[PDB]
Amino acid sequence: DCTMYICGDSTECSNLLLQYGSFCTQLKRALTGIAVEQDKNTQEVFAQVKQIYKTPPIKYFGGFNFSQILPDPSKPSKRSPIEDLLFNKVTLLICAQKFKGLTVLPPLLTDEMIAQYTSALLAGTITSGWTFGAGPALQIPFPMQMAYRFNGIGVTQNVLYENQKLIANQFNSAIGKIQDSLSSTPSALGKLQDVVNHNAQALNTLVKQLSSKFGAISSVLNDIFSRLDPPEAEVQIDRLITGRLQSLQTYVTQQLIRAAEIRASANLAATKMSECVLGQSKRVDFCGKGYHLMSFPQSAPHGVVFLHVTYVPAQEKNFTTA
């Protein structure tokens, strides 16, 4: 709220800001435009499908293990195990003392319905494959949605059926290793830790400038009206008014530039949850390094984490060709 940030509970300071005229309206109108768009950004990513597909009540998906990713009813917050860490490594007084004109509006989608959309994408990508993103969601096993995903590589289907269990064990060991690597690495959630840090840094610098002189004698508003006769006060509180208004324009202008790169990354995640997840992409080094197989979306606070699965050739030989 412009009025409360620039002037406190002062009645005569409200009329001085009114003399500037129509400056504060642009600030609120810009900030809503971001706040509406932030609730829009979640809908293009997690809400690619409308029918919330129920998770299968029976395990043993062909020979693989999806316990780490598929939600566990024994938990009191209905989330999955790998998602369980992701809510602890990322951190967020913290939100209570900022009430000096500013506020933190709650998101329209909470952490439960986001955890249900992710649990709906996961339950369709297992028993249906890519169909459920183009019409009625059909049904097909998972030891087959894998053999029709080696066919896009060019390695054909003889590699999966034959020698089936080792590929099951390689996938099982690979999903076991990803839990430990996220725990120890310092920057594992580096791209989301600094996002919540930058907003914390931006608000703290904005609120720390309320106690600055800006060329005046003091940063207090009501006391300097009584230590000084009326002409001087006007000839000094303009400095505090133009100091904080320029200090609030800098905060707003940074947010539009910052929101222009989250939207550049929401659209990169809206085109990654619709090509890697709902299909198989042939764009090189797009859906994971190497040849692509599938993906598994997972949620995170103010972000999203994709869990790619790739195919990388290994031991090689020498031959004579014609």
């Binding site: 597909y53 709650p106 049904q139």
Partner: protein, 183 residues
């Protein structure tokens, strides 16, 4: 004004231990939050008062004239302190006391009644609530739904194959250029 400090707030107690010479109290954001009483030695506290804004939940003006209101970040057990109904008209005090009261993490809206049925969203409210105008002549605030449950029957030898198709035409719209200008 006690201990030489001008300001507004709520004087309550807390669990602190001041030093025998320390007098004021300040936080990270550099504001007063703990003032020791000169006459009596104990630990006090200062909390902010009221704040928050309002939102006029209205349908189309061709269909209704009565409106709801939303109080962001105000507990329903202490609205009339933050409403201050002594200075307000009884027309405005309808949204101060009454049977229709509701609490959520987004706020404490009033003038609308919660309904248990769930269907598609019309006007967003906050933290998973949507409001719509259903008749008669009242505004409801239901819980937003995400859709129906297909509940696909997964099996190890079940395949579904379509036997007919449809051809559809989808229209999408993009801006290409805004209006040129010069000054």
């Amino acid at each position: 004004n006690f201990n030489g400090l001008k300001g507004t707030g709520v004087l309550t107690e807390s669990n602190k231990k001041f030093l025998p010479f320390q007098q004021f109290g300040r936080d990270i954001a550099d504001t007063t939050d703990a003032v020791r009483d000169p006459q009596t030695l104990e630990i006090l506290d200062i909390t902010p008062c009221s704040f928050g804004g309002v939102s006029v939940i209205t349908p189309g003006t061709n269909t209704s004239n009565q409106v709801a209101v939303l109080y962001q970040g105000v507990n329903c057990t202490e609205v009339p302190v933050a409403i201050h109904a002594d200075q307000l008209t009884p027309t405005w005090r309808v949204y101060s006391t009454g049977s229709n009261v509701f609490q959520t993490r987004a706020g404490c809206l009033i003038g609308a009644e919660y309904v248990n049925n769930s269907y598609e969203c019309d006007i967003p409210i906050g933290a998973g609530i949507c409001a719509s105008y259903q008749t008669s002549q009242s505004i409801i605030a239901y819980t937003m739904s995400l859709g129906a449950e297909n509940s696909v029957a997964y099996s190890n030898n079940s395949i579904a194959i379509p036997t007919n198709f449809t051809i559809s035409v989808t229209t999408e719209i993009l801006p290409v250029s805004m209006t040129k200008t010069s000054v």
